[PDB]
Amino acid sequence: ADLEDNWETLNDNLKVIEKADNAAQVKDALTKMRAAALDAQKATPPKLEDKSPDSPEMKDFRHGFDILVGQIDDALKLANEGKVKEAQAAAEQLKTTRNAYIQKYLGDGARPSWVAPALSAVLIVTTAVDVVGNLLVILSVLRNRKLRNAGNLFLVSLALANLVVAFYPYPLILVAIFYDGWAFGEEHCKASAFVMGLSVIGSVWNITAIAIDRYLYICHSMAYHRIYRRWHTPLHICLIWLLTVVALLPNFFVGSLEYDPRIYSCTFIQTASTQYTAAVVVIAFLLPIAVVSFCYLRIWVLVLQARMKKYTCTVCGYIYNPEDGDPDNGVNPGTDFKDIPDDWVCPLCGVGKDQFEEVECLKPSDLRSFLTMFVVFVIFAICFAPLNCIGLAVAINPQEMAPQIPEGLFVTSYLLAYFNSCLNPIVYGLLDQNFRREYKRILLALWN
């Protein structure tokens, strides 16, 4: 057999022993692993190609396999006895040592010089803005009682979803750039990769639940108010997080969470299972986008048709708000001005609904901050649109599309996706007046 193929063969068997269900499956895979490691010991590596045989260059990697095959021999002793959990454990100890004397053997891959600084600078920016920005968001929702009440409890759920990733995966990835490889165990590999899944998927579905809430608060305002919220919203916030965990469990059976040298981060592999990947691209993207687009489309047509707009009085200045109605005069909160009967008079001066001019301005803060929550979604779709397309190309034709996906393009997609984590609070401050106010209030309180 070859040497590069010998590296690819025993590395494939290393995935089989993991997903194996019995000791005979493990024993069989360790047989194909002992012979492949021995045939690699006969071959000459590319790094010590011009070096001498007795030299600690070619004789250096010779004892590396002696440590390896000996460890396999200890691992198949357990497998022979029937101990599957014991033999699979010793195989992970075979994995940690093998990676420490494999990077010393060959260097096939070639990362373009710009990935290391780009990725790291992006990560540094994102982590710094994510930790500060989404923390202010949490504090402002938790301190402001009127703000939190306006279905903005989902914003906390989303802020933590952004936050968690800045605290565990993002800093580890930055160590993996500076050390040119995964400096942590297989333990921290799949764990960091899993935290990323929760973040990315949890964010889509949180954005989805906000899209539904604002659809039902503007278009079904009457029926909406009939339906409680008190114990409702914490239940859906919990439910969406459990739905996410479930969506992420096939990764442990399909083995799609390993280190990606292209993006220097231990993440989800599109090739590992094209079926699961295809599902991930629908369930965690195409489907929420499809349902969220319907929701904001139905809002924008109502905003276009002049419905759910404020009507300011020409005489005393009283402003009608469809969100509040005029309940003491028999008009319920959620009733549009166009819907109040012609006999209605101003609750402050007494002039009829004939001398009431509408507010032409459709400010972001209006209708529970609908158009700013909209922007948040658009930005999400922009950042995650390329990667999900790359995932879609691979899920369909891996034989023709997968080797035709440029490395330089794949990095650009993960760069955008990583950048999303810090952006959400910035958009709140630029459009939403109340958040901006609260951001200022916190900073002012911190300097006094």
Q: Does position 417 bind ligand JEY by CB under 6 A?
A: yes
Q: Which of 109, 243, 244, 127 is nearest to 180 (CA)?
A: 109
Q: Does 248 bind ligand JEY (CB under 6 A)?
A: yes
Place of tokens 């549009």: 336
Residue 74 Cα distances to 36, 253, 307, angstroms:
17, 26, 75
- Letters for 105-134 (x = contact with ligand JEY by CB under 6 A, - = none) are ------------------------------
387: partner contacted, choices ligand JEY, Zn ion, none (Cβ within 5-8 A by kind): ligand JEY
Q: How far is the CB of 220 from ligand JEY (least distance, A)?
A: 33
Applying CB under 6 A, among 17, 90, 240, 281 the residue interacting with ligand JEY is 281
Of 280, 340, 376, 423, the residue at the interface with ligand JEY (CB under 6 A) is 280
Tell whether residue 345 is a contact of Zn ion (CB under 5 A).
no
Nearest residue to 440 (alpha-carbon basis) of 143, 233, 7, 29 = 143
Rounded distance between C-alpha atoms, residue 151 and residue 427, angstroms: 18
Q: Give CA–CA dist 94/70, Å, rounded.
A: 10
Distance CA 101, CA 178 (A): 19
Of residues 193 and 210, the one with the C-beta less far from ligand JEY? 193
- Per CB under 5 A, 316 contacts Zn ion: yes
The DSSP 8-state label assigned to residue 55 in this structure reads: S
Dist CA 411 CA 122 (whole Å): 12
- What residue 418 binds from ligand JEY, Zn ion, none (CB within 5 to 8 A, per partner kind)? ligand JEY
Task: Write down the H helix ranges in 346-406.
Answer: 366-396
Q: Cβ closer to ligand JEY: 337 or 380? A: 380
Q: Which of 290, 282, 287, 258 is nearest to 271 (CA)?
A: 258
Phi, then psi, of 356 in degrees rounded to 5: -120, 110
15-23, 147-155, 340-348, 387-395 -> range binding ligand JEY (CB under 6 A): 387-395
State in angstroms the smallest separation of the CB of 114 from ligand JEY.
19
Cβ atoms 415, 122 nearer than 8 A: yes
Instruction: Round to whole Å and give the CA distance between 131 and 160.
Output: 10
- Nearer Cβ to Zn ion, position 117 or 352? 352
For Zn ion, the binding residue among 318, 368, 401, 402 (CB under 5 A) is 318
200 is an interface residue for ligand JEY by CB under 6 A: yes
The residues that touch Zn ion, with contacts defined as CB under 5 A, are 313, 315-316, 318, 346, 348-349
Site residues, ligand JEY (CB under 6 A): 193, 196-197, 200, 248, 251, 267-268, 270, 280-281, 387-388, 391, 414, 417-418
